[PDB]
């Protein structure tokens, strides 16, 4: 699985979208458990998200300090941010992601954990 080297800081149920530019519309990329994983070797924290049942990776990227969480117009329980390099598909690619949670509480908690992970990744 390549997750044994890592400690689970935070785990939350979420749905992930990527913005398609050609058509101006959001497209689902996966639904399942979103995990914040701290590498015990490097102390670097990444987002790893796996789809329900298939267990395929829909999100795999470092929680970069530069990244900023921006609210969607149509959701108080979602965050939209730009990821420079995601390797879920295979080769590092730039995405405009949106991630939606079960409640405003979960989204607010995600925002605090994301910022905690960013401070760790600066060192």
């Amino acid at each position: 699985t390549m997750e044994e080297d890592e400690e689970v800081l935070y785990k939350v149920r979420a749905k992930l979208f990527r913005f398609d530019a050609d058509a101006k519309e959001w497209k689902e990329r996966g639904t399942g458990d979103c995990k914040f994983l701290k590498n015990k070797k490097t102390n670097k924290v990444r987002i790893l998200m796996r789809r329900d049942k298939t267990l395929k990776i829909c999100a795999n990227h470092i929680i970069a300090p530069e990244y900023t969480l921006k609210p969607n117009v149509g959701s108080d329980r979602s965050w939209v941010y730009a990821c420079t390099a995601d390797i879920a598909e295979g080769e590092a690619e730039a995405f405009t992601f949106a991630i939606r949670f079960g409640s405003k509480e979960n989204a607010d908690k995600f925002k605090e954990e994301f910022e905690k992970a960013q401070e760790i990744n600066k060192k």
């Binding site: 117009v73 149509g74 959701s75 108080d76």
Partner: protein, 995 residues
């Protein structure tokens, strides 16, 4: 590209290039594969491509090229065969027959090219449909002759005959005219004597297993239609039930044949045929016991291991035993020499039932239901099966599913309920002993204890009250032991839920012992405080179900109790519901609503209702005073959430109380419609200020939730109201003022489809009492809603569906409202109905055709008056032709019966002379002409222009038959289906319409 050469028909076909393009498609990848696909499609779809088929079959080295060549022939044969000169037809027959014989003679080709030979055989059968037997009389005798010359040819002829039987008997109904179906059935029936002679010879004579398989494959098809005497007055049953069960390559197909043999129509008064039905079963079971596995074999382990075709064979055994025993087990129940054969067969099903396969288990469970129901009602039967029934109790109890899976659970409940009645003592021991196994820990598991709990719940109501009482006490006592045994809150929570589930399922026990019932409710309230969300929702769900079952016990004052317990619940409702989520609170209030509806004293119920709604009414009153103090104080999204939840609490209580809710609706009604207007203004203001995107924001969605829940509350009450005078005099006028103008004057994306839904319910229950009300509803929603849905079939799907629901109920209850329309608006009504016809949306299409039928019926009621005469002259032929368009365009097949029904009604009006005036304008046809004559001339012209490949004779015969059959739906539908077949081909026989 280079591959596009084959599309150029001005040049002779490069056969070697075709074979590359075909290989690039089947063996290739990426853009190359996709490009090859578009080229092969365009080649195939070329109307002259059939001319190349002879060329390709002779010279191509690629079997897939030859396959697609036969697809192109298949296309020509089914659609344009009769257009060919007779020389070409005999020519094509010869190189198809020649190619089949060629491939059979080459042992390498016959072994390795099965796809191509099967396709050739099917293509030959398509020619037989066209020519045989009128233009090919000696085909069957020729085919029988060719069989003796070669084993490969003999085998391949069994595939030809199999496909021929499939096309004529199994799949003819859809694809041929009734007349052509009958002709081919009769032709095969006359010559089957000779076909069976060959099939019996081959099977009896034997040798090549593949030949035997192909021969047995063909027999499976024959068994669908042939007379019983071919099975019963020959040696063939002995051969199927003995010889062909021993060899495994023929075992699968023989077992499928014997399954179909059990379904053959047979005289019930023949003692010999009965012995023969017993004998083939005895033979088959004997072969299984000695050649495959004994009765004691673990079929669960065998299936799970999944070696070779064990799975398909065990499936086919289950189908055979259940099919046979469901029809014939009565034969085995009288004669005590047959007792062992009956119980062995049932013991095979027991072992099959233990297999871990949901679909296989469902098949066996269907049989077990059939049996135990028979033992429940049939006299002197049950004592035979006591040992089978005891084993089945364990099977069902060990495979019990949760109640959420309704079809399987209800199937299992019903079998286990029957089994409990048949022996209450045995069921008790099995469940108690299984519980003991959980306590000892050998079988202890979360799934096992849960699955046992569902089983114990299922049988509630079957035992005597006194037996149930003791059994329930024992189960609860044992379950409480488990809690003491297992530490850790997770493990305790699993059994705690199970314990609550059981008490939920046994209401009669709760009714009997008030103290126990009271203790359980208080624990649920304690459980509602629990931090874990799972516990809270479990606790809430249990409370509603117990309440539904024992509602009467709450409302009355119990012995040694100060007051009715409902009174006690309402005192502490605030405290009890403090930790629950909104929708869990709504369930609680709904439950209290169920109890309050049992009190039939008007004074005591209205007081209990007032006490129940205390908290939301006080919360409502504060927000009513602060809201009208300044409408800016409604911008707070937290205030929007509390309002929604107050309305939703009112919906929840109204759902369970219906007519009894009216006093509470009275308390909030005028301020609630005021709130509807205030929320409406904010949404319109917000739209202008932020744009269309505004309707997607949490703020506006928040406001729209308030509007929808208000409409839902009003819709819920009026759907269940007793006092309809109070609905009209009090509720309707304020509602229509509040919702209709707001709906009309909002932009499309701000219009709530729930308005249309609410209006439908109003017109349903009080439409006849508010003729002016229905007029007002049409004017407000009709023209502007039609404009939202009349540009495409996709946009505003909810509005689309609720629109035609509303037009349907108005047309049923208050048709007068359509007579009061301006002519231009009535024309839009007819346009709207025909617009519904063309939808693939099943909800819209069905309503569309129903409105049309109800409209024609409404016009007929009016009799000979100006509006009905004007209706028919303006709109009769629009309905006839628009109905014909959707009947014949192949894209609306799901609406076929209602189309037929409407078309039948319209034709009947003319032939019953219910239309008083000429439908034609003067100087279009001779002055004295009947509507009967003009209808057939109009329809002839219409169908001629729409289907120019049909002859005048085809169209004339069709209309002659169809018009005569206007009172006979089943035959009328037959004639329409005959027409749909003939429009797909050229040269349809006009005599087919005389069937």
């Amino acid at each position: 590209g280079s591959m596009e050469g084959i599309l150029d028909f001005s040049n002779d076909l490069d056969i070697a290039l075709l074979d590359q393009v075909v290989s690039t498609f089947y063996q290739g990848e990426g853009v190359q594969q996709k490009q090859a696909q578009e080229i092969l499609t365009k080649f195939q779809d070329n109307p002259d491509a059939w001319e190349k088929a002879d060329q390709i079959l002779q010279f191509s080295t690629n079997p897939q090229s030859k396959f697609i060549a036969l697809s192109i022939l298949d296309k020509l044969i089914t659609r344009k065969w009769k257009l060919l000169p007779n020389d070409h037809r005999i020519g094509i027959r010869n190189f198809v027959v020649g190619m089949i014989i060629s491939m059979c003679q080459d042992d390498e080709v016959f072994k390795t090219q099965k796809n191509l030979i099967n396709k050739s055989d099917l293509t030959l059968v398509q020619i037989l449909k066209q020519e045989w037997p009128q233009n090919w009389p000696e085909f069957i005798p020729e085919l029988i002759g060719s069989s003796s010359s070669s084993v490969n040819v003999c085998e391949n002829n069994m595939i030809v005959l199999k496909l021929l039987s499939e096309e004529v008997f199994d799949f003819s109904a859809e694809q041929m005219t009734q007349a052509k179906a009958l002709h081919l059935k009769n032709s095969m029936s006359k010559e089957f004597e000779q076909i069976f002679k060959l099939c019996f010879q081959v099977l009896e004579q034997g040798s090549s297993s593949s030949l035997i398989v192909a021969t047995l494959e063909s027999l499976l098809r024959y068994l669908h239609w042939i007379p019983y005497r071919y099975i019963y007055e020959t040696n063939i049953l002995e051969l199927l039930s003995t010889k062909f069960m021993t060899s495994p390559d023929t075992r699968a197909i023989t077992l499928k044949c014997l399954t179909e043999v059990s379904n053959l129509k047979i005289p019930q008064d023949n003692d010999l045929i009965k012995r023969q039905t017993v004998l083939f079963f005895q033979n088959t079971l004997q072969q299984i016991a000695t050649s495959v596995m004994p009765v004691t074999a673990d079929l669960k382990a065998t299936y799970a291991n999944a070696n070779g075709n064990d799975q398909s064979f065990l499936q086919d055994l289950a189908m055979f035993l259940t099919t046979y025993l469901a029809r014939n087990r009565a034969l085995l129940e009288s004669d005590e020499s047959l007792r062992e054969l009956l119980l062995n067969a049932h013991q095979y099903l027991i072992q099959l039932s233990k297999i871990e396969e949901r679909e296989l288990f469902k098949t066996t469970l269907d049989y077990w239901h059939n049996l135990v129901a028979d033992l429940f009602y049939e006299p002197l039967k049950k004592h035979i099966y006591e040992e089978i029934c005891s084993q089945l109790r364990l099977v069902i109890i060990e495979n019990m599913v949760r109640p959420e899976e309704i079809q399987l659970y209800k199937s299992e409940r019903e079998v286990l309920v029957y089994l409990t009645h048949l022996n209450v003592i045995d069921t008790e021991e099995i469940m108690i002993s299984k519980l003991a196994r959980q306590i000892d820990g050998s079988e202890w598991s979360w799934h096992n204890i849960n699955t046992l709990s569902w089983a114990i719940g299922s049988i509630s109501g079957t035992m005597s009250e006194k037996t149930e009482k003791r059994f329930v006490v024992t189960v609860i006592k044992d379950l409480l032991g488990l809690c003491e045994q297992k530490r850790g809150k997770d493990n305790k929570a699993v059994v705690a839920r199970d314990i609550m589930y059981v008490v939920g399922e046994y209401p009669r026990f709760l009714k009997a012992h008030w103290n126990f019932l009271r203790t359980v409710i208080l624990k649920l309230f304690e459980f509602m405080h629990e931090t874990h969300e799972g516990v809270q929702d479990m606790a809430c769900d249990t409370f509603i179900k117990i309440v539904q079952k024992c509602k009467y016990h709450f409302v009355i004052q119990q012995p040694r109790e100060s007051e009715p317990f409902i009174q006690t619940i309402i005192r502490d409702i605030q405290k009890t519901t403090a930790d629950l989520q909104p929708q869990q609170v709504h369930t609680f209030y709904k439950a209290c609503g169920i109890i309050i509806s049992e009190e039939r004293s008007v004074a005591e119920r209205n007081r209990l209702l007032s006490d129940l709604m205390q908290l939301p009414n006080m919360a409502w009153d504060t927000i009513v005073e602060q809201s009208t103090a300044n409408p800016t104080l409604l911008l707070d999204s937290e205030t929007v959430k509390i309002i929604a939840n107050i309305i939703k609490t009112n919906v929840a209580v109204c759902t369970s109380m219906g007519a009894d809710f009216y006093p509470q609706l009275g308390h909030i009604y005028y301020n609630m419609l005021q709130l509807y207007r205030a929320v409406s203004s904010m949404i319109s203001t917000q739209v202008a200020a932020e744009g269309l995107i505004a309707t997607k924001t949490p703020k506006v969605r928040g406001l729209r939730t308030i509007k929808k829940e208000i409409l839902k509350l009003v819709e819920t009450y009026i759907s269940k109201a007793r006092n309809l005078d109070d609905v009209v005099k009090v509720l309707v006028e304020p509602l229509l003022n509040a919702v209709l103008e707001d709906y009309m004057n909002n932009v499309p994306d701000a219009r709530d489809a729930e308005v249309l839904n609410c209006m439908t319910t109003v017109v349903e229950k009080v439409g006849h009492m508010i003729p002016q009300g229905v007029i007002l509803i049409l004017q407000s929603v009709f023209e502007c809603t039609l404009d939202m849905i009349n540009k495409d079939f996709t946009e505003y799907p909810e509005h689309r569906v609720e629109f035609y629901k509303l037009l349907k109920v108005i047309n049923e209850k208050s048709f007068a409202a359509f007579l009061e329309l301006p002519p231009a608006a009535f024309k839009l009504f007819v346009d709207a109905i025909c617009w519904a016809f063309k939808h693939n949306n099943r909800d819209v299409e069905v309503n569309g055709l129903q409105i049309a039928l109800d409209l024609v019926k409404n016009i007929e009621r009016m009799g000979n008056v100006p509006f009905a005469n004007e209706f028919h002259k303006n709109y009769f032929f629009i309905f006839v032709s628009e109905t014909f368009f959707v009947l014949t365009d192949s894209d609306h097949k799901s609406g076929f019966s209602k189309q037929a029904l409407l078309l039948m009604k319209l034709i009947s009006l003319v032939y019953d002379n219910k239309i008083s005036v000429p439908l034609y304008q003067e100087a279009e046809v001779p002055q004295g002409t009947s509507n009967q004559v003009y209808l057939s001339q109009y329809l002839a012209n219409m169908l001629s222009n729409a289907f120019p490949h049909l002859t005048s004779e085809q169209i004339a015969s069709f209309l002659s038959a169809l018009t005569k059959q206007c009172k006979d739906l089943v035959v009328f539908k037959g004639t329409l289906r005959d027409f749909l077949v003939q429009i797909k081909e050229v040269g349809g026989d006009p005599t087919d319409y005389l069937f």
